[PDB]
């Protein structure tokens, strides 16, 4: 076997029943499922998210957590969010109010700082661990992710009932994050300020640099399996698995990413597949489906240039590989649904592998942020109905790009955008930006 | 200012406001059956069924099938059944309900209808689940009835109880939430639909700790209603110094005109008897509605083979006759009125307390020493200072009384001498060694 | 399936690799393994035993503990023994000297009182927890248990490497015992006397009455598993599992006990098996292999009557079941090897279950003492080589009893013994004795 298949063959794998894997296809279903599982939880609830917002959607979830803990005080309830993101009237201030307005009921909210400054590391670990299940989505908890109030942010939603995996993930969070240096409660009114814990965070980050899941594989490569993965930095096991996964496509590789900004190494893999005669599908958002996109009527801001920069990346990529577009090998899809926003991540390898992850597949995720995933191996095609239904619906709001010219060029962009981008490319800062966002 | 300590107790009870339109009485066990089925079908959020037992008979099957059916049609519906742990795991007096709850769960895979057994004490004789309430969404259908043939008037013979549906978001929440925290998530509660359910001895210590937790578990909520408007006050208690027991004690002396009592087994604790006598002395009226011995479910016709347990109706009659004997003066002044209910071989299971036209206690409480110390009891206290329920209150009392004889003289009740021979011998044996007094404190 | 198999099917079970289960067959190997694991320990050493004796054997172990803590001061070393047993120049006095002669090196020795008086409860919890392994034996730490100096006490010895199980057991000890009321250091010269902590012990014992392992099963009934069990009193989960285990024998049940004194309920089970046509093997010590046995030349003492009382129990049992002896269904073995002593405990159910325990399977263990076990489920026969080798060697020093008459009767006993026993049976105290020892 080639070294790539060998890497995958020798991954530890946890066995998994087909009956214990449930897909959900819409953010509203995901909201309701989360609430349902919170109500019916008996032992533990561990909520890890980038953030939990002080809005109707987020309130819904936090109230459901307090309510479940009131009805079962023995229930082990924990919420972990990003330290920096929660503090920019902030979410952390709101977490404090909630704790005061609900005395007796113990629902701790911890802030995880992955680096001393947000721009240099965020908590992209994903997982709602509820008893023996993991409800895994890229979604944070707010109005749009949960499709409160008529506007939504499209993510993916998988519930996986699996004692062993949930234990591994729950236990990993306990030891490495919750009991880690420089984790600090956000529901404490006296929580430190970032500078005061700066050294704690540095030591913490180093501890995280080689924290990995340790568990023995119980499943061979002829049966349905799941493999949890976690990583921080270039040489994580996750990153290695993502790298080796792509070349194992005997037929076709599919990728979702919100922000098209692939590291060079993943691009090289894509090009190798195309050269070997295989197929590659890439599903990204239209610039208007990006959450930083500012309608052209509203006042333009500096940050509203990001969707344009991601489009420039897509157009440059397509430009170089137009030959493969023409042979129907390379397929690029733009997702767009009025002013809703796109946040799909993942990787499909043929009909056999499905990576579900929080990983945006960009240089940031590759070096700076704490990332994780689950790798589903389905060698018997037992999830085929759901896999196909999920891809069906993902594609439904997509246009296929048949020519790089179908994407707008810098010349077509609004004037303030155009001037900004020309200024940036003059001094070569465009290259730096693509490595930090 | 001033007020007597009894009225003060009632004035300062927390009270939940209640709309007159949201209180529906039902007057017959068959109506109660149909209402229960209707509300099960139309339930949208939750069904919490608490009963002493749910029997493996046509009546009980009807209810359990309707529960499974409603959960099938709405899988998001939160369905729970709670019954007494010990009662569910034995025959009546000679294949248990718990075994049947297991079969049902196996014959209906995918459909999640959990049946929990609540043990109120380590042995049945020392505590049973007399908590009452069918909580369905924002309503409580409150009856003393368990779920079986006679309580539901399946098949032509019935057991008379009382039936009130009260739509009230706050109260139903308080009761649903209290059940969730204190019972369902309590130590020593165990599923009866599990084939591997523990045996009583294995959970004996859990039950002891559970019972102690229950000894001071009470509803906690802020009163939203004054004493000039229609209110409901849920009450719950275990043991002598529960808030329920205190409220029952204080309630009786507030009768400015008349106190009415229903109890199936006439066996009042001495403290409640003393209250009765005080009312009679103050010149007030007291009505007591009990079953004839023949309307008791332990009564064995004199043709059939006599059994030891079939002596209970006689013992309750002896209690009634002793009481009446001492208060015959007040019978004669039309102050004390004792009614015997009797309708062929149907059985009597009315509980409650009316204070004038203003208060109505609906409860599972048999007003006996057992209920006062041993069992987990609850009630709803309806305060109707504006007489808004007067049509229904009066219709209910009308129908209760319909199958009653007034006892004008203690001699109208048979004496021990008149009883069948085996009964007579048993009772004389018991009273010789004074065990009659013990029996009246445990049943 | 019948209620007994159901009980076992629904036990929580931790998965276990066959490579991570090592049997040892001789007390000397056990000594050396313990020393080896103490040297190489990296994180924690938790030694729970009935006692740790002030003799060459015990010194060896305590010195190895001090030495390992000196070389790794971050190592978490704890020793827990029975409070009462350690104080009857005592072991506790010796633990004090050791602590003074080794300043700087922190090796705490805690005394656990299971009841206010020894006769009403002792610490029969067993387990040497070293990092991610448990070395599980019935053995205390002294000359004979460790086969220092030429005379030995036969026990069983299993090393089980398993992160989850060791964590569960380590954590259970931490919370329920070490941090329990009325546990007191024996290396403190000022340790309280029993009467002073009498009330603490009463409350402690009640806390223990429902202390049990709480953990989620990660393993099905088709794979190698281990299930830790712990109990105090009639309705413990251990006792229930022992009760349900015996009827699951489709072929044969094997029992080891040092002191033949089975509770009635376990006897009834045995008789049911015999009636169903199954096989039952019972391996006990000869009276002379009992540690209370006093040679007939030496001065007789009251306590030296116990081996005789256990023999009377065995002879009464066999008497009633001689029919089943004759059909080769019931097999009773007497172990005897010069003046070495017998301390085997356990239960084999067919080839599939192995209970390893400290439980002497007597009324004392059933009500009074704090007991524990590990239940090994081996549905795939992966331990078959080791299981068979262990039973081979256990039986090697055994005689089969073909007739109850082959056991001496009271008439055959020495005169002082005979008089004592007749005195006891006159006033019916024999029945009480069998419930307290």
Curated annotation (Swiss-Prot), chains A, C:
InterPro entries: PGS1, PLD-like_dom, PLipase_D/transphosphatidylase. One of its GO terms (biological process) is cardiolipin biosynthetic process. Residues 21-210, 225-437 form the PLD phosphodiesterase domain. Changing residue 51 to A: Does not affect enzyme activity when serine concentration is saturating but reduces significantly when limiting. A CDP-1,2-diacyl-sn-glycerol binds at residues 50-51, 85, 88, 118-119, 122, 124, 126, 138, 145, 153, 259, 291-292, 302-303, 306, 309-310, 345, 360, 364, 424, 433, 436-437. GO terms for molecular function: CDP-diacylglycerol-glycerol-3-phosphate 3-phosphatidyltransferase activity; CDP-diacylglycerol-serine O-phosphatidyltransferase activity; phospholipid binding. Its main location: cytoplasm. Pathway: Phospholipid metabolism; phosphatidylethanolamine biosynthesis; phosphatidylethanolamine from CDP-diacylglycerol: step 1/2. SUPFAM superfamilies: Phospholipase D/nuclease. Keywords: Cell inner membrane, Cell membrane, Cytoplasm, Lipid biosynthesis, Lipid metabolism, Membrane, Phospholipid biosynthesis, Phospholipid metabolism, Repeat, Transferase. The active site is at 124, 155, 343, 371. SMART domains: PLDc. One of its GO terms (cellular component) is plasma membrane. Its EC number is 2.7.8.8. The keyword Membrane applies. Changing residue 345 to A: Abolishes the enzyme activity. Changing residue 126 to A: Abolishes the enzyme activity. It catalyses: a CDP-1,2-diacyl-sn-glycerol + L-serine = a 1,2-diacyl-sn-glycero-3-phospho-L-serine + CMP + H(+). It is found in: Cytoplasm; Cell inner membrane. Disruption phenotype: Shows growth dependency on divalent metal Mg(2+) and significantly reduces the levels of phosphatidylethanolamine. Multimeric. Interacts with ACP, YbgC and PlsB, forming altogether a complex at the inner membrane. Monomeric and dimeric; existing in equilibrium, but the monomer probably exhibits preferential membrane association. Belongs to the CDP-alcohol phosphatidyltransferase class-II family. Catalyzes the conversion of cytidine diphosphate diacylglycerol (CDP-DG) and L-serine into phosphatidylserine. Essential for biosynthesis of phosphatidylethanolamine, one of the major membrane phospholipids. Phosphatidylserine is later converted into phosphatidylethanolamine via the action of phosphatidylserine decarboxylase psd. Associates with the bacterial membrane for its role, which depends on the levels of anionic phospholipids in the membrane. The phospholipase domain (PLD) repeats contain two atypical HxKxxxxD (HKD) motifs, which utilize Glu-371 and Asp-155, in place of the Asp-131 and Asp-350 found in the respective motifs, to facilitate the catalytic events that produce phosphatidylserine. This is CDP-diacylglycerol--serine O-phosphatidyltransferase PssA. It comes from Escherichia coli (strain K12). The lineage of its organism: Bacteria, Pseudomonadati, Pseudomonadota, Gammaproteobacteria, Enterobacterales.
């Amino acid at each position: 076997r080639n070294k790539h298949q060998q890497h995958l063959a020798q991954l530890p794998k946890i066995s998994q029943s087909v009956d214990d894997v449930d897909f959900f296809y819409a953010p509203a279903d995901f909201r309701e499922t989360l609430l349902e599982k919170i109500a019916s939880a008996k032992q533990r609830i561990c909520i890890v998210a980038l953030y939990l917002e002080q809005d109707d959607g987020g309130k819904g979830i936090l109230n459901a957590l307090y309510e479940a803990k009131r009805q079962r005080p023995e229930l082990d309830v924990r919420v972990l969010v990003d330290w920096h993101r929660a503090q920019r009237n902030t979410n952390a201030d709101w977490y404090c109010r909630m704790a005061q307005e609900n005395p007796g009921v113990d629902v701790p909210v911890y802030g995880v700082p992955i680096n001393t400054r947000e721009a240099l590391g965020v908590l992209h670990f994903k997982g709602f661990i509820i008893d023996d299940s993991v409800l895994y989505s890229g979604a944070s908890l707010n109005d749009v992710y949960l499709h409160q109030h008529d506007k939504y942010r499209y993510d993916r939603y998988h519930l996986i009932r699996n004692r062993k995996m949930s234990d591994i993930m729950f236990e990993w969070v306990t030891q490495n994050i919750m009991n880690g240096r420089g984790v600090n409660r956000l529901d404490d009114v006296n929580r430190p300020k970032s500078p005061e814990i700066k050294n704690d965070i540095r030591l913490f980050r180093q501890e995280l640099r080689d924290a990995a899941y340790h568990f023995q594989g119980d499943a061979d490569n002829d049966q349905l399996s799941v493999t949890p993965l976690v990583g921080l930095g270039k040489s994580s096991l996750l990153n290695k698995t993502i790298f080796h996964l792509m070349p194992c496509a005997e037929q076709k590789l599919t990728i979702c990413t919100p922000y098209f900004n692939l590291p060079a190494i993943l691009v090289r893999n894509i090009i190798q597949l195309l050269r070997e005669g295989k197929k590659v599908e890439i599903i990204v958002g239209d610039k208007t489906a990006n959450d930083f996109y500012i309608p052209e009527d509203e006042p333009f801001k500096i940050i509203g240039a990001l969707p344009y920069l991601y489009e420039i990346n897509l157009r440059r990529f397509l430009s170089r590989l137009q030959y493969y577009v023409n042979t129907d090998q390379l397929v690029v899809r733009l997702w767009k649904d009025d002013d809703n926003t796109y946040h799909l991540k993942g990787m499909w390898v043929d009909d056999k592998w499905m990576l579900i992850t929080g990983n945006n597949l960009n240089p940031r995720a590759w070096r700076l942020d704490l990332e994780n995933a689950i790798l589903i191996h389905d060698p018997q095609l037992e999830l085929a109905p759901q896999r196909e239904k999920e891809l069906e619906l993902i594609r439904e709001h997509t246009t296929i790009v048949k020519h790089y010219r179908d994407l707008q060029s810098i010349a077509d962009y609004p004037v303030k955008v155009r001037k900004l981008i020309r200024r940036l490319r003059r001094i070569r800062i465009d290259r730096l930006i693509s490595r930090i966002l």
